[PDB]
Amino acid sequence: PMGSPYRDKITIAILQLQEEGKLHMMKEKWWRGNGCPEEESKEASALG
Amino acid sequence: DLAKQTKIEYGAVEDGATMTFFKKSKISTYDKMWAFMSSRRQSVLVKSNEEGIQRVLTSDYAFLMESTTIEFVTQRNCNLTQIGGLIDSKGYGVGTPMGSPYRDKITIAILQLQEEGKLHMMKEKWWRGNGCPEEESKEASALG
Amino acid sequence: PMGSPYRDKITIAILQLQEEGKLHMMKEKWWRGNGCPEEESKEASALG
Amino acid sequence: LIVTTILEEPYVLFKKSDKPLYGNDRFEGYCIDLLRELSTILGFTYEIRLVEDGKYGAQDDVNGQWNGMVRELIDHKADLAVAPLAITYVREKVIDFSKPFMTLGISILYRKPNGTNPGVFSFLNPLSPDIWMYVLLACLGVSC
Amino acid sequence: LIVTTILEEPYVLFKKSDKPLYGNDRFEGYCIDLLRELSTILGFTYEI
Amino acid sequence: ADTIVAVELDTYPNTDIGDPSYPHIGIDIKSVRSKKTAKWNMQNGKVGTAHIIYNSVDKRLSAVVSYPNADSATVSYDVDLDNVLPEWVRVGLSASTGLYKETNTILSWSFTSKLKSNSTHETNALHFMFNQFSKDQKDLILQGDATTGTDGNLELTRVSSNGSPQGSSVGRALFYAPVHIWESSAVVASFEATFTFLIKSPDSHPADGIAFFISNIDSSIPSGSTGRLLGLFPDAN
Amino acid sequence: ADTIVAVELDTYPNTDIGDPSYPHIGIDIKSVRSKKTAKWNMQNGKVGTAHIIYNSVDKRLSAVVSYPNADSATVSYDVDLDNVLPEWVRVGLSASTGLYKETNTILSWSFTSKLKSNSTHETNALHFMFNQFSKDQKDLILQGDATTGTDGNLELTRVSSNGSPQGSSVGRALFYAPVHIWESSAVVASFEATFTFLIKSPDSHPADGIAFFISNIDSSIPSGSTGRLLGLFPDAN
Ligand SMILES: *[C@@H]1O[C@H](CO)[C@@H](O[C@@H]2O[C@H](CO)[C@@H](O[C@@H]3O[C@H](CO[C@H]4O[C@H](CO)[C@@H](O)[C@H](O)[C@@H]4O[C@@H]4O[C@H](CO)[C@@H](O)[C@H](O)[C@H]4NC(C)=O)[C@@H](O)[C@H](O[C@H]4O[C@H](CO)[C@@H](O)[C@H](O)[C@@H]4O[C@@H]4O[C@H](CO)[C@@H](O)[C@H](O)[C@H]4NC(C)=O)[C@@H]3O)[C@H](O)[C@H]2NC(C)=O)[C@H](O)[C@H]1NC(C)=O
Ligand SMILES: *[C@@H]1O[C@H](CO)[C@@H](O[C@@H]2O[C@H](CO)[C@@H](O[C@@H]3O[C@H](CO[C@H]4O[C@H](CO)[C@@H](O)[C@H](O)[C@@H]4O[C@@H]4O[C@H](CO)[C@@H](O[C@@H]5O[C@H](CO)[C@H](O)[C@H](O)[C@H]5O)[C@H](O)[C@H]4NC(C)=O)[C@@H](O)[C@H](O[C@H]4O[C@H](CO)[C@@H](O)[C@H](O)[C@@H]4O)[C@@H]3O)[C@H](O)[C@H]2NC(C)=O)[C@H](O)[C@H]1NC(C)=O
Ligand SMILES: CCCCCCCC/C=C/CCCCCCCC(=O)O[C@@H](COC(=O)CCCCCCCCCCCCCCC)COP(=O)([O-])OCC[N+](C)(C)C
Ligand SMILES: CCCCCCCC/C=C/CCCCCCCC(=O)O[C@@H](COC(=O)CCCCCCCCCCCCCCC)COP(=O)([O-])OCC[N+](C)(C)C
Ligand SMILES: CC(C)CCC[C@@H](C)[C@H]1CC[C@H]2[C@@H]3CC=C4C[C@@H](O)CC[C@]4(C)[C@H]3CC[C@]12C
Ligand SMILES: N[C@@H](CCC(=O)O)C(=O)O
Ligand SMILES: [Ca+2]
Ligand SMILES: [Ca+2]
Ligand SMILES: [Zn+2]
Ligand SMILES: [Zn+2]
């Protein structure tokens, strides 16, 4: 809210998590899903 | 990769936030770099970023630094590049003293400059890409 | 030594570390060195 | 106000002019042109001053004190820190940052390896230079 | 809790630096990192 | 940067930055771009006998370097240390190596100043005669990667892999006590030295040179001085 | 308590702590209770000439003081400097007063040690000759309330109250650099001194004596020394 005693406590706390890397660990925990098998997965090409 | 070869010297800038990240890190790869860099602490830790540029141009040195200054170097020197991805994410804050009335008024005035593109029109001006061979664009390689 | 009050304290303690995986984390911290570039690194073969 | 800063290309750098540059005239770059626009919005008067010790800011962890622009802010010598002063965990505890005007990332500056071109006698490469003689001595031999 | 150890890489080895170190911090390797973890869980001083 | 004046016994030819085409003696005034140079024979691991005077009644800064059965390297440049070097200074030795190998072993070092209360009013001194550099010599502020002891020697290198002198290493040997100079009580202090050294060949075409500086009372190894900058200068101009 | 060996030129009888009924030159081995004393004449504002040696060819720790047209007080006590005083020292001057005032102006000071690198082979030295104490003499670690400058003088009292030097004042004048002694390369370290003082008559029974010590490398004013403790002792033992 408009002036809170919990902004600066979290502002320091978010900076701790990306220093430890846990904001990157939780990033790779949810956004990483199936690899979405790429366009370079030809494996066969009968010329048509 | 870069933590596991002592063939290439690598350091950072002294009194800076790059080596402060490695000084306080506890993950195995980045502490291994700080286990490397703490030994030859004078040999690899250069004084400013400009000496961090120049000792890559001369020696077999790989300099750890920020992305937004690599964006200005590699658009000027077309033999240097950004090896690897972003290690972490940080930002440039307009620093104010502890408990200031100008913290919030600049917090307004940065967001106002960002929604109307002023913080992008200035970055396009002062980084001035200049033309540079970007890549061979690794693909099929039609014989000239 | 031949009968110690510190065997069983470590016997439980070693089992904690491989459950957490730190015996594997310290394994990959020291035995992993340079990749020793493999025999499948041909890159050129002029026929002689 | 008194705005501390530091030379770092292309953020803050001296302006190229022959005249006896006065006050704020000698400075040009990104971060002062940021502060040229922050001064129009908030309606104040900045007055650029360098950092004295020439560092950014770091904890000397012997006396537990600070250097650089961070020490310039805690002692209230200069009111802003419009600079490439990054946002880290150990700096936010002692001074107050604004929101970022730029997003960073730590990475590696290193030389591009030189891609020596496959010069115009490239098609002789798939056989060794003694085998091309052995074929030539064959068609000079078998024909005889 | 006197710990008798014998120098073999990469298990224990001397920590190289500019300034010479003195005591338990002279040593590094796998078995030093193991004995730190045993001293963290159980809780005991150790003299190499 | 610290204002620093040295007498470089440089061994790497740098026609880039003003070192001549040969291994030389050189005399530096606040710049690695020297003032005078002279040819020096540069024999292998042998003894040393170098010497520096600066008598302000003659205002030359002469020097010689002598092996046995060799010749003197007279590099006397006319410079006045009135205005080019601070009031209270800190003398000492500087050595370096980089991308090559060479030995930087000092075996003895001395000094003698005599500075003018009112010229015949019993001039001061700071004479010392370190022939026997010991293990825990605590009147030296040896910086860099410089060591001492293990013999009567001053080993200004990371050394002792059969002495193979471990390239890209910088060593300094700052003496502890200051010396009044500027002029101010005028500057007739004929400060002598003796700079016995042993530059042994590692069979490597050995080249990065030893120095003898006169720095400010506060110094360090500035921002990388391993190499052609030769242990003390920050900048190559 | 720091280990310290001094030569008290005590200008005040201290009968409670072993100083004799007469003002005296003394000698100290970790004790304000002196080993050996001798009668000193203690003239008014005049000058100076003191001299202290210890040659281990004779192992006598001697000290002499002479005004011009006065005698000499040989107070030589054989003491073994092997074990009574550490390897590395920090020599200097010490002076104090208390409840009686006196001027303790030193106006020149020297020192000359010579310790056996290998007895013939070019022993070490630390010769200096401070005849010209400056206003900003930055090779003195002058402690306490010692002053300097404003003339060629070393004023080891809070002075310039018309030369009535503000009683219960104390000021030490430690030299900046350490000296090798203990034995280790045995103990012929014939340290010399020359200690030209000035003790002005305050018309107030001039009193509390000047010293010349050889202390530990770390030192300060011990626990308050304005008086009988003479500037350098914590206790009266
Ligand atoms: C019995 O009743 C006592 C009541 O007097 C009582 O009090 C006192 O107790 C303290 C211990 O707690 C102890 O004090 C000593 O007194 C010494 C002599 O008195 C001097 O000085 C005192 C100042 O302390 C003055 O108050 C006196 O009047 C007298 O000095 C006069 O001073 C003026 C100055 O303007 C002169 O003009 C006068 O001419 C002079 N009159 C005289 C000399 O008759 C005192 O000196 C002791 O001080 C010592 O340390 C000080 C620190 O540097 C220096 O002053 C100096 O070093 C002193 O050393 C003594 O100095 C004497 C010269 O004054 C010399 O004999 C020697 O150099 C040295 N003495 C010795 C023996 O070595 C100290 O303060 C006394 O016990 C006592 N004071 C007395 C008697 O004055 C007692 O506790 C009661 N009980 C008992 C059991 O006695
Ligand atoms: C992109 O394109 C550039 C093209 O330039 C390429 O980058 C180049 O990489 C080169 C790496 O070699 C670098 O080379 C310069 O070499 C010359 C040649 O002289 C010697 O210089 C050094 C030693 O003095 C060595 O690094 C050189 O390799 C060469 O010496 C040989 O070194 C052998 C190993 O030490 C040695 O074997 C033993 O050595 C000892 C000691 O020397 C004894 O001799 C012993 O008996 C030997 O057994 C060889 O004998 C030795 N041979 C000779 C003839 O000496 C040189 O000019 C330079 O180094 C000198 O100059 C610098 C200038 O400051 C000075 O500081 C040094 O101390 C040294 O005196 C270089 O090393 C090129 O500079 C560099 N180019 C650029 C622009 O950076 C890249 O490879 C390309 N990228 C790709 C392909 O991806
Ligand atoms: C199946 C048919 C067999 C025929 C038998 C006869 C074969 C006899 C051949 C014998 C040897 C010939 C090749 C030499 C070896 C090549 C490797 C090399 O290092 O050379 C190099 C130097 O460039 C040269 O010098 C190449 C030689 C030029 C002559 C080629 C004549 C064509 C063959 C005659 C045919 C005529 C018709 C035949 C009869 C009707 C080439 O490589 P590069 O590209 O320069 O790399 C450097 C580039 N860079 C500097 C930028 C980095
Ligand atoms: C019966 C049996 C026979 C009897 C024995 C007889 C004795 C014969 C024994 C021979 C022994 C072998 C000696 C030669 C070795 C060469 C290999 C080498 O490394 O050098 C180089 C060869 O590159 C060339 O330059 C080749 C010459 C041009 C090619 C054209 C020749 C044929 C043309 C068409 C033929 C028409 C066919 C018509 C058919 C009817 C490669 O290295 P490089 O980097 O390029 O070096 C550059 C050198 N240069 C600077 C000078 C250029
Ligand atoms: C018909 C004639 C003219 C053809 C050319 C000459 C022939 C006979 C000669 C020239 C060089 C010779 C080769 C030289 C080297 C080797 C490697 C050895 O481990 C096996 C034999 C082998 C593989 C030889 C086989 C025969 C060879 C190819
Ligand atoms: N410019 C950074 C330091 C250098 C870096 O972290 O790359 C800062 O001021 O925090
Ligand atoms: Ca050189
Ligand atoms: Ca006394
Ligand atoms: Zn040179
Ligand atoms: Zn006494």
Residue numbers in the entry:
A (entry chain B), C (entry chain D): 769 to 816
B (entry chain C): 673 to 816
D (entry chain C): 433 to 576
E (entry chain D): 433 to 480
F (entry chain F), G (entry chain E): 1 to 237
Quoted passage from the original study:
Kainate receptors, a subclass of ionotropic glutamate receptors, are tetrameric ligand-gated ion channels that mediate excitatory neurotransmission. Each KAR subunit has a multi-domain organization, including the amino-terminal domain (ATD), involved in receptor assembly and trafficking, the ligand-binding domain (LBD) that binds agonists, competitive antagonists and positive allosteric modulators (PAMs), the transmembrane domain (TMD), which forms an ion-conducting channel, and the carboxy-terminal domain, which determines surface expression, synaptic localization and interactions with intracellular proteins. Here we present cryo-electron microscopy structures of the kainate receptor GluK2 in the presence of the agonist glutamate and the positive allosteric modulators lectin concanavalin A and BPAM344. Concanavalin A and BPAM344 inhibit kainate receptor desensitization and prolong activation by acting as a spacer between the amino-terminal and ligand-binding domains and a stabilizer of the ligand-binding domain dimer interface, respectively.
